[PDB]
């Protein structure tokens, strides 16, 4: 299971699977 931290919406056929912190900011995990 490959997963990304993404500043925008998930790529789709990609599910939002958690969150991630980069530089004081939350963003979407997206796993495919």
Beta bridge mates, 29: 5, 18
Resolution in A: 2.8
15-24, long-range: CB within 8 Å, 24+ apart, which pairs? Answer: none
Its domain, for residue 2, covers: 1-32
Torsion angle of C-alpha atoms 26, 32, 8, 25, degrees rounded to 10 = 10
CB 29 within 8 A of CB 20: yes
CA-based radius of gyration for the chain: 9
Specify whether the CB–CB gap between 29 and 3 falls below 8 A: yes
DSSP-derived letter for residue 7 is: S
Q: For the sheet with 15-22, list strands across it.
A: 3-6, 25-31, 15-22
Please give the tally of structural domains in the chain.
1
Closest listed residue to residue 2, CA positions, set 21, 24, 25, 13 = 13
Task: Report the chain's terminal Cα–Cα distance, integer Å.
Answer: 6
């Amino acid at each position: 299971a490959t997963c990304y931290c993404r500043t925008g919406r998930c790529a789709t056929r990609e599910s939002l699977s958690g969150v991630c912190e980069i530089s004081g900011r939350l963003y979407r995990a997206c796993c495919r």
